[PDB]
């Protein structure tokens, strides 16, 4: 008579069953807990609940999908979907405008009291909480332990519960499975090393990729819409190679240990966590600037990281290109004069050369020997500076009367 | 017992579902609303039940071979073998030709090729060909240079047109994975270089008639290759480029978008909303077929080669060429 009788009878009892054509797995939903089970396992559940093991599981075929904004069910095109996102308690909570004070002190302590970046993070966090989308930006919190980086994780972990992954390590990534990304709004990573590959570089795409592949054990490899947002806690060690011109990472050094503050009592740690609801309420009541979510800033620490990560040869080439003497002097070129590698006259010619962007071989070698600490041949300097960073062309120019081999910037 | 060996096939066609058994994959295929899935038998029996109210012991459907042939019809019969098509066009693939490209999209493209018509137009001729003719080009494009030049935006833009036919932001990690579905039924395959060179295998993917496809819970299977490769990199060479190279166009772009006049906030999003516009434009190109697989010695490609190639080679060549000047 009826292809869905069993569906309905189990709905009568507050269980929603379906077959998930995508995962070829029967899904089941009670009390905002979603599980996927094989058929036999369902038959075992069904038996317990109606006292009959039917040969045919009379349930609808949906596609389970983690769409936080969308309803309990919907039908894109001709396909009926069912939702795997169920909001946590503290996601369904009444807006407020004040943030709990002890929570505020944590956040202040953490951003070293800098409103700009702190407020930007709250705008990010709010957007994630409220709109529940991918930002395309990630936050790195580095600096010494006990600065409440880990506490911020626990705090958030409470608000988001199942939608957050916590303390994911390099080891978890080397695992062939990766359920730490399945149905996650926030994904926290811990770095723990003395690094100085940086396998968390793979993350950079995750930040911005529309979709992820999800290999789970005993499940099909499946591609899903990406709702991930990434926080990374680090020791001092840099966890990701940061390009100069970077748009994904906000970096926040915090070395304000909590136990060295006035306001820190014993019960503070726990007090903070008890105010999770308070901080949820606050986040729910933010008025979200949508343009500031994916904004990044050149914090002091991000700059230090870049100027150490980027190749010294690049930095030379850029100073050659920019005709930027000041850089070379900042990096101790003036030492050429002290050691009598060159006289007062030639030193004028040498500086002139950098600025004008016309550099005789014997000055180029003198410069690059002096900046780098041992002598490099023209050949090397060409192959490892001038050529790869397109500084310019090797040519002749007549200086005085003699024709001189030179590099002509441009 | 049986009167008709395909009754079930037909009844499910009545309801706009096309079911078959793939001999190649020994997996039952199913097609609704231009979404193709492959499922085990039990899973099909579960679907069938829901739709007719009867679980038959025998799945009365035709045996075809699923094949991703974009040019070819919904079905055909090479030799004596009936095939069924896994290519279904996305919305913006079926869209009406035009001759003007949306202006804000044009500014992206201009920005990206540093306003160089030659190479830019060549890329449009490539992209058009892929869009229109839907074949393997045998050429690939590398976009390197600093972030926020709209390399990533061009990927999202195209990702909207091609949808499921393009793989996005494939990394070294994905390649070290034993599976590789990022090549299964793909017209475009985008890669991110992030290191500060395992992608040399792509060299061959660009030109190989066929690929092996290891997918989880599926048989390793060999398929006709429709891949075309874009690689975003961030100043790190992703692939060893031979002096005399015919596969790679390289395009350095350091024009950050946020440093242009025309860049507003809503620009990022505006660009993506014009995906349909840019699709329409691509559909209306008149494709020079000889220029598709053309490559050029951009400034950056040369720099890459003269740094990649061995100094000892360069000495020897100067000895050979009797070239004092070098
Ligand atoms: Mg092959």
Author numbering:
A (entry chain C): 305 to 500, 505 to 718
B (entry chain E): 303 to 498, 506 to 635
Pull verbatim passages from the article behind this deposition.
NrS-1 polymerase is a multidomain enzyme and is one key component of the phage replisome. The N-terminal Prim/Pol and HBD domains are responsible for DNA polymerization and de novo primer synthesis activities of NrS-1 polymerase. Here, we report two crystal structures, showing that NrS-1 CTR adopts one unique hexameric ring-shaped conformation. Although the central helicase domain of NrS-1 CTR shares structural similarity with the superfamily III helicases, the folds of the Head and Tail domains are completely novel.
Totally, two NrS-1 CTR structures were determined, one in A-form and another in B-form. The A-form crystals were grown in P212121 space group; per asymmetric unit contains six copies of NrS-1 CTR monomer, which were assembled into a ring-shaped architecture. NrS-1 CTR assembles into ring-shaped hexamer in both structures. The helicase domain forms hexameric ring in both A- and B-form NrS-1 CTR structures. NrS-1 CTR forms hexamer in both A- and B-form structures, however, as confirmed by the size-exclusion chromatographic analysis, NrS-1 N618 exists as a monomer.
